[PDB]
Design a binder for this molecule. Structure first.
Ligand SMILES: O=C(O)[C@H]1O[C@H](OP(=O)(O)OP(=O)(O)OC[C@H]2O[C@@H](n3ccc(=O)[nH]c3=O)[C@H](O)[C@@H]2O)[C@H](O)[C@@H](O)[C@@H]1O
Ligand SMILES: O=C(O)[C@H]1O[C@H](OP(=O)(O)OP(=O)(O)OC[C@H]2O[C@@H](n3ccc(=O)[nH]c3=O)[C@H](O)[C@@H]2O)[C@H](O)[C@@H](O)[C@@H]1O
Lengths: 450, 461
């Protein structure tokens, strides 16, 4: 039941896919054009922030089931199944990957689009492979999207909610489908986790899922902003609607918006694809609009409280990464908040358990046209230090360390006991009793807040 | 354990609420202004299409735990807890109309002589309980009264046609109460009242009044959003040859999204989603906020209700004179006679406007569809002359150019295509609810036009 597999692209998705498939007994070749990334992996290091991944990689390297190389030809010759797992920030990489398989392949290949790619990409992949073959075998291209979450990727892969497989129903298609069935059998020994459909529907599914997740978030963010206008508590509302099983409890946390390298990119790509086919996605456009403005809500509340000129003010920032348990700064709400406060003259002292180095890098690039503003941005070693002389503390990313802080320690440090909370971590009444002026998103402030 | 309760407004919400609460041992007085409705209930009839309701009513009348009356003063004197369950239809500007709610409140204030818990069970905008309190307090001040009270929010989450089951086995019970002295007194009374429902699982969510009020709108708005979300994707699926039902399985299998309420089709209707979505939009706009997503959700639903006529016009032409269409399904959803905002009404108007003849079938809603469609098209008598209603699903297809499925009644899920093949002109089906597998339709020689999925080969050809 063991298969020879190649993963093309050893980024987050490709690396966990390859290592975990090796771990169930497949013989896996992980290919990447990035020689440093490959050297690092071959040296025993892991280029990414993923719990449990180092140990999976190590034991499968030792067992002879997992290799890392930049050797394109060797990669093609190895894998009967070729997973395309390159980035999609733009399809040249996906297509270049396809051409290489076509340029070197010798027997039947199943080519698996695992990267998130627009509907119709498998057809373009097929054409690229075909024409290479023309210059000189059969194959079929399958869609098998990834549903991993950054920082939880090993668990997400090893215990998936479902595995979606899009395949043609022609002869090479059914042969590919049988091979994918064999490949994923170890995940299907209890509940059937695999969902088979046609290629285009599988392609569409990945965008639709991320789009729905984003829609839930922006939906609650609009209601949170309304809650702040008419005296309601969005967390009460979240539990009140989540308890309808047709809605469910997850991804309904209002706050300072969504970021990351997935939702913004995928919802924008779907909006673009639709418009290119002559349809305006009204709901998704609203979703994207709402999120862009939601990343300004913390600054809106701060300006309402302190005025437009924040010169002479200092704000402590708790959280920089787009979500907890990652160092990923891509589309992080913290970047918008920091730019806005710096533009208004404030000093910023920022803390994040892991993302400080990457945050300093990308915020400096964000603000390259105003290099002097960076003179007012500092990053500290521990969360309490950020609060020194602060007019207010601003919570952006709900790392666990922020959930139960030492408010007495903070009270000896800050200038005024005011908190703006983009993630709704604390009970407003508790904040009231502690003499803290509390400004959450969509919930009534502490008594001091009004 | 038993408490004396009054329900003000004996429409479906009030009737089901009153009868089911009498059935757990409470002594319930159901008040309504409509003397005919009350006469009918006292003669053992039921004004609504709710399975099981007539039986619960009969049992509790016999037990002396359920009374029906138009006597307002008797109603107020009876109930220590007064549920306001009157209707909240759209006002002219689309906001919730609170005239009946406030009239009920004033009646309580004008007659009450001891502590009252006033329960807003009607769907009412955030802030309504405060207006109810102001109105009750005004009536008490006029009277020189010393009486205290508290207004609680306790929304209803019943589905029409399944109300008894939804009430007796709720997913949750939402109770919004103030935390002042009268408010805590009320909360404890509400806890007592619903105790039987929390015996084994805690089903009640307690929160503040405004959050309870908001919860009801938010829940219906989210359900509507899931539907319009999938309808937009269905229309896109057609453009790049994907299958919306495969996408539904593919995203519904993420438990963060869930499987329910992801059925694309010819749109949502009924007496709740359209009015509640519009009322929330209005409430927000009156507070200076534009709800961009909900406005989009409403806009796509409006256009979705035109999709079936669009497909039919694409297939047969702008002029449908001399064409006949069979309509399967009239009610806004299965298992009800409710015609409010039904997609069938828009479809039928568009087809008649273009000259078509229509033969319509619904297992239950024919009487009501007759009434409202005659109203819809009052300006166009000649259109109504081309509309008929049949008593048999197959008879609708007599001489029909196509069959159009609008409401997924179970009887439609297993058609007798032999019976149909004897009747229709051409085996063409436009399916607003995606009942059948396209491949299966291709095999039976049916030209099948679903929403957001590839059709049969005949449809493609
Ligand atoms: O396409 C992908 O690769 C992945 O994208 C997301 O994963 P990810 O972006 O890592 O993280 P999420 O946990 O979805 O968080 C996304 C953003 O939403 C925010 N969020 C999340 C949930 C919520 O209720 N509210 C909310 O604001 C988070 O703070 C974060 O900024 C999806 O959750 C994965 O299923 C998907 O595979
Ligand atoms: O406010 C209310 O009293 C009730 O409103 C709705 O109940 P209802 O209007 O009876 O009907 P639904 O079953 O929700 O159907 C609404 C519409 O959505 C359509 N729909 C539903 C589900 C779906 O996946 N797709 C879809 O188009 C249905 O055909 C129907 O036209 C809610 O479901 C109840 O929870 C709520 O208590």
């Amino acid at each position: 039941g063991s298969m020879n597999l190649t993963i093309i692209g050893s980024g987050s998705v490709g690396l966990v896919t390859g290592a975990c498939l090796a771990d169930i007994g497949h013989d896996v070749f992980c290919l990447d054009v990035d020689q440093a990334k490959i050297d690092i992996l071959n040296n025993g290091g892991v280029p990414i922030h993923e719990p449990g991944l180092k140990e999976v990689i190590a034991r499968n390297r030792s067992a002879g089931r997992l290799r890392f190389s930049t050797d394109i030809e060797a990669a093609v010759a190895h894998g009967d199944v070729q997973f395309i797992a390159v980035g999609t920030p733009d399809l040249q990489y996906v297509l270049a990957a396809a051409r290489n398989i076509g340029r070197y392949m010798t027997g039947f290949k199943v080519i698996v689009d695992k990267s998130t790619v627009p509907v119709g990409t498998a057809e373009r992949v097929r054409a690229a492979v075909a024409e290479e073959l023309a210059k000189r075998q059969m194959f079929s291209v399958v869609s098998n999207p990834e549903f991993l979450k950054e920082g939880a990727a090993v668990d997400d892969f090893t215990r998936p909610d479902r595995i979606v497989i899009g395949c043609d129903d022609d002869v090479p298609g059914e042969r590919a489908r049988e091979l994918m069935k064999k490949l994923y059998a170890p995940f299907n020994r209890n509940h059937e986790r695999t969902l088979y459909m046609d290629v285009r529907s599988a392609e569409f599914t990945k965008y639709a899922a991320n789009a729905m997740l984003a829609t839930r978030i922006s939906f609650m963010n609009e209601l949170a902003n309304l809650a702040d206008r008419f005296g309601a508590d969005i967390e009460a509302v979240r539990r009140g609607i989540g308890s309808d099983p047709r809605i469910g409890y997850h991804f309904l946390y209002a706050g300072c918006g969504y970021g990351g390298s997935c939702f913004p990119k995928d919802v924008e790509a779907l909006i673009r694809t639709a418009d290119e086919h002559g349809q305006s996605l009204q709901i998704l456009k609203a979703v994207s609009s709402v999120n862009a403005t939601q990343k300004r809500v913390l600054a809106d509340k701060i300006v309402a409280r302190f005025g437009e000129d924040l010169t002479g003010r200092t704000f402590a920032i708790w959280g920089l990464a787009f979500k907890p348990n990652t160092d990923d700064m891509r589309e992080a709400p913290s970047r918008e908040l920091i730019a806005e406060l710096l533009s208004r003259g404030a000093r910023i002292a920022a803390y994040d358990p892991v993302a400080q180095e990457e945050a300093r890098r990308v915020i400096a690039l964000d603000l390259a046209d105003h290099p002097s503003w960076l003179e007012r941005l500092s990053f500290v070693d521990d969360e309490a230090q950020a609060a020194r002389d602060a007019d207010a503390l601003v919570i952006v990313t709900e790392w666990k360390i922020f959930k139960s802080p030492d408010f007495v320690a903070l009270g000896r440090l800050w200038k005024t006991p005011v908190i703006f909370d983009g993630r709704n971590l604390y009970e407003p009444e508790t904040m009231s009793e502690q003499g803290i002026e509390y400004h959450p998103i969509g919930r009534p402030g502490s008594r001091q807040a009004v």
